[PDB]
């Protein structure tokens, strides 16, 4: 997260850290008791390594009783996701067992009604992604409140040049943005999960390159199927 601040610990009990070989790789969001939603490209980046999901965390390094590292039973990437595209960049991860719910661990209701978030709406993104271009990895959860950017502006040639489909949304990036390591994390608008931070080779904090989020509502039937 660029241009944010340290989040209040455990104020986002849905926040997951998708790890590979005990190291944070991507953000994630607890959507059901045994299901964590993330981004398809994270599974590619994980490859060989042991994929685990850390719930109830604030600090990645400091131990706490709320912190629980789960093994992944099954990794379900969206069937239409490709490594050379940003389309259908969703991934559902089944935990080894149902997560122990409490003040620090709770699933987040995700948007079911396929209607765009209005442009200018302030949404919250959180993550353990880089906080500087130098590649600094924060130990503690960061967050930032970003205004949603309309799709037509986002598709200007200067920006994403038509790659933003109806199944995607954008947010402002100028000096405030989601970055490398924030992919797979949540974009929450008025208490509702609306988007998942999309993977890609996008530079962060640049006004010419708005942040990209896959709209969860667009994949409602695919999420329902895997979660049952």
């Amino acid at each position, epitope marked *: 997260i660029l241009g944010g601040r340290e989040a209040e610990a455990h104020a986002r009990p849905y926040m997951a850290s998708v790890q590979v070989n005990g190291e944070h790789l991507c953000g994630g969001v607890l959507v059901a008791e045994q299901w964590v939603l993330s981004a398809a490209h994270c599974l590619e980046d994980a490859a060989d390594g042991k994929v685990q999901v850390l719930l109830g965390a604030h600090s990645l390094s400091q131990p706490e009783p709320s912190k629980r590292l789960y093994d992944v039973l099954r990794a379900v990437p969206h069937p239409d996701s490709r490594p050379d595209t940003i389309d259908h960049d969703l991934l559902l991860l089944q935990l080894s067992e149902k997560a122990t719910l409490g003040p620090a661990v709770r699933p987040l209701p995700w948007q079911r009604v396929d209607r765009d978030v209005e442009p200018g709406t302030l949404c919250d993104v959180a993550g353990w992604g880089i906080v500087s271009h130098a590649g600094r990895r924060p130990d503690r959860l960061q967050h930032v409140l970003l205004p949603v950017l309309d799709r*037509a502006t986002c*598709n200007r040639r*200067t920006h*994403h*040049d*038509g790659a933003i489909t109806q199944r995607m949304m954008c947010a402002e990036s100028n000096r405030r943005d989601s970055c490398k390591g924030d992919s797979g994390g949540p974009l929450v608008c008025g208490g509702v999960l609306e988007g998942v931070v999309t993977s890609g080779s996008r530079v962060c904090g640049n006004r010419k390159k708005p942040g990209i989020y896959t709209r969860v509502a667009s994949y409602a039937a695919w999420i329902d199927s895997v979660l049952a």
Partner: antibody, heavy 115, light 108 residues
């Protein structure tokens, strides 16, 4: 396939107004904004401005601030250019160009201003 | 608000010659330069877009170069069908800006 079909040639007297249309098809109209470009006879391309098809916001180039207004009709996926207080110098081909993706232009509309 | 100076105004070159056209911007625009071709009696066609990206289906003899304020369009081996007026367009921010154009003619 993407298409942008503009309205036919116009003849207008000085002082009058004209409204040129640009009908889009083969893509989600509100996903891409629209630029308006002018070409006076035997002259170069002039970027007039942009209209955001999603929000309705408009940006005009300095030379096109005043008598030029962009508008929409999202239900028929159409963008309009209205020119007021027509001058003989407004005699030009006006194009619409879809902003972003595979580059698409309308065929142009020639507007002649004469008594 | 951003200004653009295109040169030359016109040129004549033979089939197989290399044609080079310049566009200089008033301010730094990173790589947000586009190049259009407009053949006589035709609609403008985008050949090159930001980052000197050659648009699919456009012959490889067309290439763009430059970043910042100084941009160049090169036609490496001028063909009879390349006869047209070429226009650069900066797309750093709104409003976009076309150059004055360069009329390319064939010397035969």
């Amino acid at each position: 396939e993407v298409q942008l079909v503009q309205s036919g040639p116009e003849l207008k007297k000085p002082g009058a107004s004209v409204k040129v249309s640009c009908k889009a098809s083969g893509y989600t109209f509100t996903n891409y904004g629209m630029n308006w470009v002018r070409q006076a006879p035997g002259q170069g391309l002039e970027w007039m401005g942009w209209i955001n098809t999603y929000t309705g916001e408009t940006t005009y180039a300095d030379d096109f601030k005043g008598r030029f207004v962009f508008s929409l009709d999202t239900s028929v996926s159409t963008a309009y250019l209205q020119i007021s207080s027509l001058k003989a110098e407004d005699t030009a081909v006006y194009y619409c160009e879809r902003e972003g993706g595979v580059n698409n232009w309308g065929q142009g509309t020639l507007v002649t201003v004469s008594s | 608000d951003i200004q653009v100076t295109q040169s030359p105004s016109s040129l004549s070159a033979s089939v197989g010659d290399r044609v080079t056209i310049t566009c200089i911007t008033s301010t730094d625009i990173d790589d947000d330069m586009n190049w259009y071709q407009q053949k006589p009696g035709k609609v403008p066609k985008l050949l090159i877009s930001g980052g000197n990206t050659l648009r699919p289906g456009v012959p490889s003899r067309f290439s763009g170069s430059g970043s910042g304020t100084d941009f160049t369009l090169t036609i490496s081996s001028l063909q009879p069908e390349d006869v047209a007026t070429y226009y650069c367009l900066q797309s750093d921010s709104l409003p976009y800006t076309f150059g004055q154009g360069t009329k390319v003619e064939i010397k035969r």
